[PDB]
Amino acid sequence: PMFIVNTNVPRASVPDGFLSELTQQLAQATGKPPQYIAVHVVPDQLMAFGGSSEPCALCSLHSIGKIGGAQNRSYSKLLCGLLAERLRISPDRVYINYYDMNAANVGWNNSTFA
Amino acid sequence: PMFIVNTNVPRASVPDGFLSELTQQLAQATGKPPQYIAVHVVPDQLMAFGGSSEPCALCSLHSIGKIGGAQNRSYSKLLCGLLAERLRISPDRVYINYYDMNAANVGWNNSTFA
Amino acid sequence: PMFIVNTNVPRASVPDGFLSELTQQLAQATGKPPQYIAVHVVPDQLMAFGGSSEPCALCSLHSIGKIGGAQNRSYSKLLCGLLAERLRISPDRVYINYYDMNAANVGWNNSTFA
Ligand SMILES: C[C@@H](N)[C@H](O)c1cccc(O)c1
Ligand SMILES: C[C@H](N)[C@H](O)c1cccc(O)c1
Ligand SMILES: [Cl-]
Ligand SMILES: [Cl-]
Ligand SMILES: [Cl-]
Ligand SMILES: [Cl-]
Ligand SMILES: [Cl-]
Ligand SMILES: [Cl-]
Ligand SMILES: [Cl-]
Ligand SMILES: [Cl-]
Ligand SMILES: [Cl-]
């Protein structure tokens, strides 16, 4: 899977080990091996949410399976909690788009997973 | 909804109020509440369009509904107009990808919209 | 089509002509005219792959058609080869998400391709 967070929070406010916490927490939540989890954090962005430049985040989670109604509700609670605790972003200023990818549409290591 | 613009135009060339202008114009175009509209502008990017590094933009609009044949033509006219007037980018050097998101696949405020 | 690479490799390690090289190789691989190929390279990113931050890349290819099982395997070999030879990124630390876009969902030049 891949998880991306784009935020206006400054780089200095991203705590050490944040990529590792995302990796481990997502491995547990999705059930996928940590070796297959990629994470990408983009601070200092020029962004607004509801017209306001207070701290916010736009995120995405792509996974081959492990995406659905109940699972995405659980992911949102986990990820909003982490963004609130670690980046001080209010959950009502976070979007997370979820993508259930077909294996044939995910390339890796000179091929695709299909 | 969420609107992202990636561009090679430098940050100093993005005028004041551009995030607000995008927020207001997208609220009217999509009909969605301004409170739910998120905007993200990424200048100074290493990009080419048609092999050329002249000013260009790659954009995306994600929305729960309000995406379709006619609506997307109207959004493209509005958004290319703004990128031309405000960033001086020619409309034939802009792509905008449109995504009609299922409510179950959009997280916000510790939950999803499903 | 549009190809985006996000990588932790620093900007100074992105060789001259890399955007043109991607444009040319993608024009041939997708069969599309190079005038329609857009490329975007984002170096210096805060990323981890499988828990570590050795060089890695998260990429996407969006195209109206020319996406499928066999084609995506071919694109992955081409693109991982280029990331390995030019950016020194191991193919097993690259993900590429493929998107077959409907023409009605791609805006360009004040309209869409539909
Ligand atoms: C069905 C769709 N892939 C198609 O035939 C096409 C090809 C080239 C450009 C287009 O806008 C659309
Ligand atoms: C159907 C679903 N995509 C599936 O069963 C799968 C699981 C794990 C890896 C993978 O590539 C594919
Ligand atoms: Cl970190
Ligand atoms: Cl589910
Ligand atoms: Cl898919
Ligand atoms: Cl929406
Ligand atoms: Cl129309
Ligand atoms: Cl969806
Ligand atoms: Cl590391
Ligand atoms: Cl195919
Ligand atoms: Cl589509």
The β-bridge partners of B112 are: B107
Residue of B nearest to C16 (CA): B46
How many independent structural domains does chain C possess? Answer: 1
Set A1, A34, A43, A55: catalytic member: A1
The CA-atom distances, in angstroms, between C105 and each of A64, A70, B73, C79 are 23, 28, 9, 25
The β-bridge partners of B3 are: B39, B61
Distance in angstroms (rounded) separating the CA atoms of residues A10 and C61: 29
Q: Domain of A61?
A: 1-114
Residue nearest to atom 1 of ligand 1 (CA): C65
Set B1, B15, B43, B91: catalytic member: B1
Distance in angstroms (rounded) separating the CA atoms of residues C80 and C15: 16
**Is the separation of the CB atoms in C1 and C35 below 8 Å?**
no
Instruction: Measure B11 CA to ligand 8 centroid, in angstroms.
Output: 32
What approach was used to elucidate this structure? X-ray
**CATH classification at residue B31:** 3.30.429.10
Q: What is the resolution of this structure in A?
A: 1.2
The answer, yes or no, to whether any atom of ligand 1 lies below 6 A from the CB of C104, is no
